[PDB]
Amino acid sequence: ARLNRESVIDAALELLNETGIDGLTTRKLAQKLGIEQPTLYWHVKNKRALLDALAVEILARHHDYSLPAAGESWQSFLRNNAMSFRRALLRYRDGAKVHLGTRPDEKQYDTVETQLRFMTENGFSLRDGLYAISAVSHFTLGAVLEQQEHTAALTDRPAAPDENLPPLLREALQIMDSDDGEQAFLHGLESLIRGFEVQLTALLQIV
Amino acid sequence: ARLNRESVIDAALELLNETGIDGLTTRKLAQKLGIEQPTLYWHVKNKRALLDALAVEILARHHDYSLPAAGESWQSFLRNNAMSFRRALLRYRDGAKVHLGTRPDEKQYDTVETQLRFMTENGFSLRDGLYAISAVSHFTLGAVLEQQEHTAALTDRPAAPDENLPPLLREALQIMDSDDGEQAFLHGLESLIRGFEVQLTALLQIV
């Protein structure tokens, strides 16, 4: 196998789907690429470095609404950007967990700066613009993680009684398991955006 | 060491703080309790069972605003409950990650049902009541996870250039690292609540 950056990442992503984040080891990556371990080490030093790179690559490859379009409202941008962020996390097993704890990479500086400038140009303080951005990110990460892990632990865990469930909770579970969690995510997303709009609009008024 | 349920959990939580979720093994738990492994197995069958129990115990012990007070508004309850949920997750290393993927335990049925009944009594459909509840949970889990993991990976990861940072992003990072992430969480929480209020209020009106 070829051992440049692109090829290693490609093989690491494939491996992530097969084994998940817990079972993604340097050993298994060397076996996957048909090489001895000291050969891999030349290229990739440890698991952390691998994961940091994957976090950046997943967004680079699949997160395609990272910038506002010409004349787009801040409401719209946040919605579209949240939707894009969600898809990209979803495309790989444990994708959301690969993201967790990372900060913007050098490769992402210009992009993330532009998002901050863009909010402030629309009348947000840097601070409220940051909070808006952060709340969308967190809401989105949380939604995705609960479902990615729920579906993962579905193997080991018993399942669910269903018999001695109370009636609202029973119907609640049927509703969350209906779809991705997409509905609940899109509805919760709108609440979040409208609340930022009410905050911005009010200015110094008591609200 | 005594080996009942209470004692095992107590020792498992202590261990979780020392090693985190990744390094919490049955082997190390047997060494911690001064026992051989087949002795532990009698009591605790595997890691998953352990973790499921911890998830439930952390909330039982430290999540103290799980119910509305007499005559409390739905706005207030959601706020207080989110704040309580956050603290409880924060009390242990990887606490939020211990929660992830779990569903309400038998021990939590009555409590979670009451929360659903409570929203519907305030004019939510079961469905919008569920979504409100879920969005708060996800927002809260996401916020906590990003900071718990950020602080964890702070050991392995280089750090941050700081030199070639763009200016808004530079000041953004100084702002998020100012505190827990508490400020950003509490502000994002208010936006979320007000947005649910706008949705509920409007009824069948276009909004």
Ligand SMILES: CN(C)[C@@H]1C(O)=C(C(N)=O)C(=O)[C@@]2(O)C(O)=C3C(=O)c4c(ccc([N+](=O)[O-])c4O)C[C@H]3C[C@@H]12
């Ligand atoms: C944070 N608040 C909103 C609630 C809560 O306080 C408790 C609790 N035990 O007190 C919880 O169990 C809670 O944190 C929690 O984890 C929940 C769930 O996991 C959950 C609920 C309802 C439905 C699903 N579901 O997936 O279908 C859930 O995963 C109830 C919510 C209620 C959540």
Ligand SMILES: CN(C)[C@@H]1C(O)=C(C(N)=O)C(=O)[C@@]2(O)C(O)=C3C(=O)c4c(ccc([N+](=O)[O-])c4O)C[C@H]3C[C@@H]12
């Ligand atoms: C989801 N939207 C809102 C943004 C985004 O689309 C990108 C991106 N590269 O396109 C991201 O890098 C993003 O997902 C992301 O992970 C971010 C961060 O990790 C992040 C940001 C600003 C500040 C911090 N911080 O901790 O201080 C962050 O952790 C920018 C946001 C912008 C986030």
Ligand SMILES: [Cl-]
């Ligand atoms: Cl080749």
Ligand SMILES: [Cl-]
């Ligand atoms: Cl090569």
Ligand SMILES: [Cl-]
């Ligand atoms: Cl004893």
Ligand SMILES: [Cl-]
């Ligand atoms: Cl005993």
Ligand SMILES: [Mg+2]
């Ligand atoms: Mg991020």
Ligand SMILES: [Mg+2]
């Ligand atoms: Mg839960």
